[PDB]
Amino acid sequence: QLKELTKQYEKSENDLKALQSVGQIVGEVLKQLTEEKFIVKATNGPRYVVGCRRQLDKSKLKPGTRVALDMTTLTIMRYLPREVDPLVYNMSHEDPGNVSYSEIGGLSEQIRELREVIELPLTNPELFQRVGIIPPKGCLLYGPPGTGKTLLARAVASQLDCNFLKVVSSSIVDKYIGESARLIREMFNYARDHQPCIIFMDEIDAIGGRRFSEGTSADREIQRTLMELLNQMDGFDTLHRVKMIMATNRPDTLDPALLRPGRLDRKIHIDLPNEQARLDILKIHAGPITKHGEIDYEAIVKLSDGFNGADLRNVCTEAGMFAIRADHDFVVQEDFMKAVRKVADSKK
Amino acid sequence: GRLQEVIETLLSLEKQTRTASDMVSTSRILVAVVKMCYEAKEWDLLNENIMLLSKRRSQLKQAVAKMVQQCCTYVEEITDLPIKLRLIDTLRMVTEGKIYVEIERARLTKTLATI
Amino acid sequence: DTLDPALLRPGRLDRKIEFPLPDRRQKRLIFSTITSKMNLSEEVDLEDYVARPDKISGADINSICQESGMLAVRENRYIVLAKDFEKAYKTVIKKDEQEHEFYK
Numbered sequence A: 001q002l003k004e005l006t007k008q009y010e011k012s013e014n015d016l017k018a019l020q021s022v023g024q025i026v027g028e029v030l031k032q033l034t035e036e037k038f039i040v041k042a043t044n045g046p047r048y049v050v051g052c053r054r055q056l057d058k059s060k061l062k063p064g065t066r067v068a069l070d071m072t073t074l075t076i077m078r079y080l081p082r083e084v085d086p087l088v089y090n091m092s093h094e095d096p097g098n099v100s101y102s103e104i105g106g107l108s109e110q111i112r113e114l115r116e117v118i119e120l121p122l123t124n125p126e127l128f129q130r131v132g133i134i135p136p137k138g139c140l141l142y143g144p145p146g147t148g149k150t151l152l153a154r155a156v157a158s159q160l161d162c163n164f165l166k167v168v169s170s171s172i173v174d175k176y177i178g179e180s181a182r183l184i185r186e187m188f189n190y191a192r193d194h195q196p197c198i199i200f201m202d203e204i205d206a207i208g209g210r211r212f213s214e215g216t217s218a219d220r221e222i223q224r225t226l227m228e229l230l231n232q233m234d235g236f237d238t239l240h241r242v243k244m245i246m247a248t249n250r251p252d253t254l255d256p257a258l259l260r261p262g263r264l265d266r267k268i269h270i271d272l273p274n275e276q277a278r279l280d281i282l283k284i285h286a287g288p289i290t291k292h293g294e295i296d297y298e299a300i301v302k303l304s305d306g307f308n309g310a311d312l313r314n315v316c317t318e319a320g321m322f323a324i325r326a327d328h329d330f331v332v333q334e335d336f337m338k339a340v341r342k343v344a345d346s347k348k
Numbered sequence B: 001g002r003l004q005e006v007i008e009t010l011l012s013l014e015k016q017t018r019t020a021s022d023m024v025s026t027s028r029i030l031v032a033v034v035k036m037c038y039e040a041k042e043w044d045l046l047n048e049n050i051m052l053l054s055k056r057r058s059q060l061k062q063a064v065a066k067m068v069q070q071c072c073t074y075v076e077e078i079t080d081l082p083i084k085l086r087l088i089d090t091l092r093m094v095t096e097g098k099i100y101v102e103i104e105r106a107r108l109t110k111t112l113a114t115i
Numbered sequence C: 001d002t003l004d005p006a007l008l009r010p011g012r013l014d015r016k017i018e019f020p021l022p023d024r025r026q027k028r029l030i031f032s033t034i035t036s037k038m039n040l041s042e043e044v045d046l047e048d049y050v051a052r053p054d055k056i057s058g059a060d061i062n063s064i065c066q067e068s069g070m071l072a073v074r075e076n077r078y079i080v081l082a083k084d085f086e087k088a089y090k091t092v093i094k095k096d097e098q099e100h101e102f103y104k
């Protein structure tokens, strides 16, 4: 009758002492530690002169420091570290699905090559100025669709250590003006904070160039966003620890400025499965479905080319569909054979 | 005289070792190529095989590397007296470029720094 | 091409500096510099790939030469001899264009 109210009621006395608190506005000190008074810049606010905490650590109050300020009296309070957006809904989380290079089929050259160019400067960086050159920064995963692009970086997502910044390039842009450039400088400054880091911007035709002349509102807002993204891929350093890679369809609509070796050096052409990669995809998506033994993969692969990985899991998906409305045990050979010949009906 | 022993056996080796186990055999048959290329005591036909064993090595899950212990466990075997050494000459343009061969041009540099 | 036709007018700029996408008498100097900060073993040639002068920046000279070194990292080599030069160049030595025979 007393310990219960003491614990789970007197623990909830905290609401009054925390209710007494007042909250503090934030701002950025435009430095000028005018000794006793500094000039700070509020977020949506004016620049103005503020007094100080009187026993604050003034010597590390660097120009461009997030600081908290009082509301009524307005004297500067306890400082802050440099913020992060919901880039937490960017870095801290993506699509790494314990997918490995086992699910990646038939492109071992491209994934060994991407793996070496992207994390092998992070394994042995000393061998490169040994040869006498800095490592490259970017790769552009241009290809026909399907084909393992977005995923490929899923396998890279679940096999690396650094914060794999996986972002869709069209959740970048917002309706407010100068906002997307805030987001992209926040992204790359966040990459400066945690190193080494990998920044995955797929589908990038949203920020993809071939800059225009005349739409003047919905495009020049992004053709100045691509200026900030471009002048921080380039920068005045080389970013020296972080490596971004971008995956898209339509490389023939991208900006020349963003393609010039430097922003994206080793442009990788991921390609449709030839025959060997076709049977690779067919075995991998034919794996966890129950099977036959001597199920003729070779006539399926021989049958009609020009598919994608997505189209071959569409084959096993349609054949499992055939058994699931046809009520059989697994498939038959005529269910793969009836599966490909309906996928082959699906042209453009 | 002793050519087709090492070369005939090696022609038998290039399909039973190269295709495809080779791994411990990289420290076995190549070292047997050089020690059976040394037990007949030739020096013309010695430095005519190591450079003709490069340029094409093996298949997947084997290596082009690991002939450096095939080299370095062979160099300090003879201390032939006057001067003849192609051991110092041929092993400075055939072992071009590896991170494993630091002790080849380093300790063979020291061999040049003493002889 | 779309900068503004009031940003110059002899007062706001008064100048204009063209950057050339360089050619023969310059391209040689770019290769001489970028190769002069690498490890070479002289099986390379200089003016052979100064030849075929076809539409290069300096950035893709740094890409084919940087790519030459990185393609030499395959065999864990501290130099580059013959193929990584030619090799990387051809691979991304302009990944080609689209000619067009008859006319020309």
Ligand SMILES: Nc1ncnc2c1ncn2[C@@H]1O[C@H](COP(=O)(O)OP(=O)(O)O)[C@@H](O)[C@H]1O
Binding pocket: A103, A104, A105, A106, A107, A145, A146, A147, A148, A149, A150, A151, A152, A247, A281, A308, A309, A310, A313
């Ligand atoms: N080599 C491959 N192996 C397995 N799946 C593949 C392969 N290539 C493409 N895919 C399919 O593509 C999907 C991933 O999307 P993706 O191909 O990257 O399209 P986008 O490039 O538009 O993201 C996967 O769900 C997968 O089924």
